[PDB]
Amino acid sequence: RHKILHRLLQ
Amino acid sequence: DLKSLAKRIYEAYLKNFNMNKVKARVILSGKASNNPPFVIHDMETLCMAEKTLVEAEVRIFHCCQCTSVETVTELTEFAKAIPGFANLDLNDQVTLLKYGVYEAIFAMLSSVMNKDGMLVAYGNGFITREFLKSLRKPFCDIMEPKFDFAMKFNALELDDSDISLFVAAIICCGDRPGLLNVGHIEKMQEGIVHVLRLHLQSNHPDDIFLFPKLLQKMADLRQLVTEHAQLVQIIKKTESDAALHPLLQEIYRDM
Amino acid sequence: LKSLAKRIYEAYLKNFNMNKVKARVILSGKASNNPPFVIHDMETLCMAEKTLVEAEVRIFHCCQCTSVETVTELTEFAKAIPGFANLDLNDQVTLLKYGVYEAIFAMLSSVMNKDGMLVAYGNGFITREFLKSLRKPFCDIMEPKFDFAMKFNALELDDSDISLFVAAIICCGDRPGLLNVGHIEKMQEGIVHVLRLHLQSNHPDDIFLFPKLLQKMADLRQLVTEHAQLVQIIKKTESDAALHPLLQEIYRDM
Ligand SMILES: CC[C@@H](Oc1cccc(CN(CCCOc2ccc(OC)cc2)c2nc3ccccc3o2)c1)C(=O)O
Ligand SMILES: CC[C@@H](Oc1cccc(CN(CCCOc2ccc(OC)cc2)c2nc3ccccc3o2)c1)C(=O)O
Numbered sequence A: 001r002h003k004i005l006h007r008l009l010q
Numbered sequence B: 001d002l003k004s005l006a007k008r009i010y011e012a013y014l015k016n017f018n019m020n021k022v023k024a025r026v027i028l029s030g031k032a033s034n035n036p037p038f039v040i041h042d043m044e045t046l047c048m049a050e051k052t053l054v055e056a057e058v059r060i061f062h063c064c065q066c067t068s069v070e071t072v073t074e075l076t077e078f079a080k081a082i083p084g085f086a087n088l089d090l091n092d093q094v095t096l097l098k099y100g101v102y103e104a105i106f107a108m109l110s111s112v113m114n115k116d117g118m119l120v121a122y123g124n125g126f127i128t129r130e131f132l133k134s135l136r137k138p139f140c141d142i143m144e145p146k147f148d149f150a151m152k153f154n155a156l157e158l159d160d161s162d163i164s165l166f167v168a169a170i171i172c173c174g175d176r177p178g179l180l181n182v183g184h185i186e187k188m189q190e191g192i193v194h195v196l197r198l199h200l201q202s203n204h205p206d207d208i209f210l211f212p213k214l215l216q217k218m219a220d221l222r223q224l225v226t227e228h229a230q231l232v233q234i235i236k237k238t239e240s241d242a243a244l245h246p247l248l249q250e251i252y253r254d255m
Numbered sequence C: 001l002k003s004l005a006k007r008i009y010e011a012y013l014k015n016f017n018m019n020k021v022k023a024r025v026i027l028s029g030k031a032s033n034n035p036p037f038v039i040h041d042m043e044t045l046c047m048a049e050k051t052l053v054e055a056e057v058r059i060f061h062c063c064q065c066t067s068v069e070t071v072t073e074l075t076e077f078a079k080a081i082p083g084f085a086n087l088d089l090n091d092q093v094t095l096l097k098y099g100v101y102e103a104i105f106a107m108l109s110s111v112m113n114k115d116g117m118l119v120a121y122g123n124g125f126i127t128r129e130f131l132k133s134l135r136k137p138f139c140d141i142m143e144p145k146f147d148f149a150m151k152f153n154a155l156e157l158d159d160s161d162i163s164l165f166v167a168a169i170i171c172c173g174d175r176p177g178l179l180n181v182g183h184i185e186k187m188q189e190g191i192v193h194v195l196r197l198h199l200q201s202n203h204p205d206d207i208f209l210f211p212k213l214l215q216k217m218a219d220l221r222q223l224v225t226e227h228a229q230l231v232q233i234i235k236k237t238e239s240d241a242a243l244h245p246l247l248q249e250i251y252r253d254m
Helices: A003-008 B002-016 B021-027 B043-047 B056-079 B090-112 B129-134 B144-155 B160-171 B182-203 B210-215 B217-238 B246-252 C004-015 C020-026 C042-046 C056-078 C089-111 C128-133 C139-154 C159-170 C181-202 C209-237 C245-251
Strands: B038-040 B117-120 B125-128 C037-039 C116-119 C124-127
Touching: A003 B056, A003 B090, A003 B246, B002 B056, B002 B160, B002 B182, B021 B090, B021 B160, B038 B043, B043 B056, B056 B090, B056 B160, B056 B246, B090 B117, B090 B144, B090 B160, B090 B217, B090 B246, B117 B129, B125 B129, B129 B144, B144 B217, B160 B182, B160 B217, B182 B210, B182 C245, B210 B217, B210 C056, B210 C245, B217 B246, C004 C056, C004 C159, C004 C181, C020 C089, C020 C159, C037 C042, C037 C116, C056 C089, C056 C139, C056 C159, C056 C245, C089 C116, C089 C139, C089 C159, C089 C209, C089 C245, C116 C128, C124 C128, C128 C139, C139 C209, C159 C181, C159 C209, C181 C209, C209 C245
Parallel strands: B038 B125, C037 C124
Antiparallel strands: B117 B125, C116 C124
16 A cells, blocks of 8 residues: 555655 | 665755755854854744744654655655665555664764754754653653664764665665565665665775674664654654654554 | 683673573573473474564575574674684685685584584574474474584583684685785684694593594585575575575675
8 A cells, every 4th residue: 555655656 | 786785876866855964964063154054952942943943742752753754755765766666566666665764864864863862953952852752651752762762873973974774775775565566676685785885885984794783783673663653643643733744654554 | 822712702602692601501491480382283383483572484584584694793703713804805704705604504513413403592402303294395404414423512511612612713715706815815824723732631532523523614615606606596486485684795796
């Protein structure tokens, strides 16, 4: 899942 | 190859973390090159620095959180500069950093600590280790353990060029749960750790067995985090008044 | 300089958490209060996981811990061997890279008996049978070190002997990549001279002990090589079982 980490690593 | 890797990692570390050991050492046990750092001892000294640069306990718990969130952001950027990290499965990039960040934070947190207290508010504040001990339970148990670890770690006398390489090694760590292509990370770590050794030997000829001493602390950091993780759930459930920035609440869920 | 033995012995007692005396007492020793927790079934392993901090991988990971501690204790032990400080930095590193796992497997014998080995600072005892039991190839980690241990424990060495041996293992001029080879061979001669003189005065009964012992430094070389390969293969076979980066580095190019 991890909505925010996904966001910071794109 | 490894010529760049060390230096590329170091550049990444200088680019993304505004507080570094050199900046922090100057400010600590320095004179007043312009202004020395505002000291926070009594609760009077805390408040008189809450409009200057920003219950009493919960103001601290919230302020800690804020810099953790900034640092996780700096760490996600730092990570994307580690050669090969970008190319990993995004899912893995995320797993590595979830478990990674608070180990990386407590290592780097050592750089602003000395035996008597720690730098806060980007080097403008200095909050005394004694005042933090002073706090009502369980807020007193937050920093002290990180101090204990710091004094041992600062004892190694590392420079930012060393710390950068170590934090990379901490992040790229294929024994985190839930990784898919474990292999591509283990190779990534081998390279980072080889360089870490070679670097320590040429840069600390005085202490040739620094590399082994350092790496046995990767274990102590895991412990320190776990112990932190428990104490955070307890503060989250002790005070309904002091909850957790959703990023931190997300790195913590199931750890 | 008849104290060289004693200085090395002091260094050996100062740096290593477990030694033969501590281990012999705990093994076949009365419950001074409580005897050491036995690990047979997979239930008995788990029962001791959170007690003092998959199934096969828990073992592979746990082993790693004490290896890592011991490398560090060994780098300190090494800096107490007279003349070691003065060696070329580069050589100090080469001697210890090849040295440590030999010194580990020698000292690992001191916690072993025919039935199992002491772990977790003397509080655990994990049965040789349970370790055989493990899924291939994890069963082939410990058994060979047991085989070696039984033969080595047979020599009946005391810690004062073992200290001198481990020093002799470390200061070893036939490691690959040594520069000042000569100044090490001198350093070994001194340590090994003392080792023999010590064995003659301490074990007058067994006057073939010094030669018997020496031919074990060879078996240890083998045992390590065989270990080193088996570990790389488990690291690369199982995505589930990683290797502490220190160990992965002491193994790199060996
Ligand atoms: C929610 C619980 C929280 O715990 C901790 C525990 C330890 C460290 C942190 C993050 N941190 C502490 C500064 C905040 O401390 C004050 C104190 C007083 C103050 O006065 C206004 C302002 C700030 C920090 N500093 C750093 C400097 C360099 C590198 C990394 C650093 O990490 C948070 C967490 O888990 O995130
Ligand atoms: C990954 C491969 C790994 O192989 C080995 C192989 C043999 C020995 C070791 C190191 N060793 C740990 C054995 C117990 O390890 C546990 C600990 C707890 C436990 O409970 C779950 C089970 C096993 C040990 N060295 C000692 C030196 C002196 C005295 C005692 C010692 O003991 C590692 C390596 O290369 O590091």
